[PDB]
């Protein structure tokens, strides 16, 4: 995250670290969502290679194990069937981990909250990326959980010309765009958690950035809308 600063500790529980294996040691590479205690939800492009992976909840700090971590294993990997690796702008950039083990609720790991099915948010509506991810294009992950505001930017104003053209679709979420605040590298699968009736729920995965760069002007940060995706992720539940 770009332009973020420090989540309070375990402010964001159904935020986890997405891991893979490498020679002995753990190497954190995407977001996810808790969404079941047994389910997570993050971006295929996440799980693009054939990698052991594993998921941390109740993460704060990546560099130290602070109390709160729950450390499990990825049993099975369901990317959307539609997904492209070629083709990130055609959509579809989204997966769901089945756990070795299910985690234990608790203060510090919980259930994330998913938008109704088809819920489009007003332009310029409030909503934090959270994530591991850069903290300055072409710069180094965060050790501690950061955050930062990004306002929703609606898919007419988004898919304009002067924003993401028609790079961007109708089945994608934009958010931010003001040069200065933006995910990055290491954020990808992670949520964006959007103020609706009080209530924050986890309406975007984040996607993609410009290839100038993280924080770009007029190039939002895009998230898979996760609206689009409700009966299919209650379709791979179900039958998973
Ligand atoms: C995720 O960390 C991110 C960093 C540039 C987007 C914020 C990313 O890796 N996106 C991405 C990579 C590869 C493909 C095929 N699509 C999207
Ligand atoms: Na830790």
Not at 60 to 75: A, F, I, P, R, S
Not at 109 to 119: F, K, N
Request: with cysteine; hydrophobic share 35%; glycine share 10%.
């Amino acid at each position: 995250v770009v332009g973020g600063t420090e989540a309070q500790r375990n402010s964001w529980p159904s935020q986890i670290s997405l891991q893979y294996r490498s020679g002995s040691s753990w190497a954190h590479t995407c977001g996810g969502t808790l969404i079941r205690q047994n389910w997570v939800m993050t971006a295929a492009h996440c799980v693009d290679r054939e990698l052991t992976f594993r998921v941390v909840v109740g993460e704060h700090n990546l560099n130290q194990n602070d109390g709160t971590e729950q450390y499990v294993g990825v049993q099975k990997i369901v990317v959307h069937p539609y997904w492209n690796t070629d083709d990130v702008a055609a959509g579809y950039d989204i997966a769901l981990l089945r756990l070795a083990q299910s985690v234990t609720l608790n203060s510090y790991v919980q259930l994330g909250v998913l938008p109704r099915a088809g819920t489009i948010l007003a332009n310029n509506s409030p909503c934090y990326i959270t994530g591991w991810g850069l903290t300055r294009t072409n710069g180094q992950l965060a050790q501690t959980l950061q955050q930062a505001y990004l306002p929703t930017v609606d898919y007419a104003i988004c898919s304009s010309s002067s924003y993401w053209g028609s790079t961007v679709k109708n089945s994608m979420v934009c958010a931010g765009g003001d040069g200065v605040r933006s995910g990055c590298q290491g954020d990808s699968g992670g949520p964006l958690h959007c103020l609706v009736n009080g209530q924050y729920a986890v309406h975007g995965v984040t996607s993609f950035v410009s290839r100038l760069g993280c924080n770009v002007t007029r190039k939002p940060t895009v998230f898979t809308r996760v609206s689009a995706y409700i009966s299919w992720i209650n379709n791979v539940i179900a039958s998973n």
